[model samples]
Target: MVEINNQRKAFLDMLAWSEGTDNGRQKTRNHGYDVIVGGELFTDYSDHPRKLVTLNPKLKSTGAGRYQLLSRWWDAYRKQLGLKDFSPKSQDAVALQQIKERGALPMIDRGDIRQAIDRCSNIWASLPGAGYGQFEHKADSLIAKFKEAGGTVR
Candidate 1:
């Protein structure tokens, strides 16, 4: 029970799919950097490459990296967290910190991923009710993936 609290394996996949960062594999690593709003990629991890992409007819973005971090957010986290690179380590750290701030870490640890995701919607456009006009994941589907990922009970 204590061991299963908020296990992270399955939850990782939930974010990967929601962020479109998952390759064929269920886990997204530095490959999350491979995703850009447009069909482009950034190979450098020295910093968040604030590249502008024409997202569509009505949107343009400087979003990149794991969790699709925007340039400004990166600026904020990079300074606050002392992250010097956009490497996977820094990326994951930022996400964890963001979760902690939203008070979702405890919920996630309790295996209450639904509310956890809901709580973080503002931070993740791919989350349901994010209002970012993107296709968000249903809580039901996220739960199934979480179960498939193992490490918890319903």
Candidate 2:
């Protein structure tokens, strides 16, 4: 059984809504790898200088994993979690950690939908008022996914 608390359920829904559940192997257009999938590995600077150069002319490190974590973001979390690799479990853990760090965990636990989203929107480009990039998924769609995941977000 995929048992989890309401908070975890809502968090999972948020990930699915923001990053695509690409069977664990989706890459972002800007050269991010394994976006929204478990066990997501980034195209690291150490591992793929040439490929990174080809894919991203600016050599930028973007989001990876189910939460669409940027390289810098992942790096910091990696150290905090003492993780050596981007395994599926590690990715999931880090994502939860990020939610906690963003102060949304309490809101999620209490089922405060809008507050949870508002608290963490700054971290994800797919949410409105992200104040960062151009891509923002429809709020309705995201809410639908959250509801599908057994969460009530209005």
Candidate 3:
């Protein structure tokens, strides 16, 4: 039973660390819409810099929005949450939904920040990867950002 505010803080912190909050639809070097705060359409470019193409030729940006969610990831959550646009609220909600889905909600509620990070890291490239060819921010910096956003990293 996680408080929504805690979840919000975690998501916001993650967003700031992983995607720059430039207050608009700023593009990532990896081609994601890094800082899409609100009211921006998601990118539809077929080829994005960090898009992973499997040997089977499966494609998807890795895509856009403040959370840097790829189409496949966002699409699944979008439908589940009835999201229509990439509004700031939408992005925030979807990110929390992801955290919950990743089984980090209990850890988050307990203020077990380390455990929460471990559980949710697979969902974000900015967190330490679960060996998914993902790049990550240094743990200390990410923890500082999380604390700044009102998270208790105990």
lDDT of each: 0.73, 0.60, 0.60
Query: What is residue 57's positional error in candidate 2, in angstroms?
Result: 8.7
Error of 2 at 146 (Å): 0.4
Among these predictions, the greatest TM-score belongs to 1
Candidate 3 Cα RMSD after full superposition onto the native fold (Å): 6.2
lDDT of 3 by residue, 37-127 (tens): 3224435433222343343433323555656677676778767888776665666677788888888877776777667777777776567
Clashes of each: 1, 3, 1
lDDT of 1 by residue, 1-154 (tens): 1122346646655676667776454333455655565546777788888888664666778767767788888899889988878887777778778878889777888878888888999898888888876788887877777777674644
Residue pairs with backbone overlap in model 2: 36-65, 36-66, 39-88
lDDT of 2 by residue, 1-154 (tens): 1235875766675665566644234544322334422333445422111112235545344555556666677778777888767765666667778778888876777777667777778777667668655567676766666777788654
Q: Rank the candidates by lDDT, best first.
A: 1, 2, 3
Considering summed lDDT, which 10 consecutive residues are worst modelled in model 1? 1-10
Q: Which stretches of candidate 2 lie over 4 Å from their true place?
A: 1-4, 21-33, 36-61
Residue 42 lDDT in candidate 3 = 36
Give the residue spans of candidate 1 off by over 4 A.
Answer: 1-6, 23-30, 55-58, 151-153
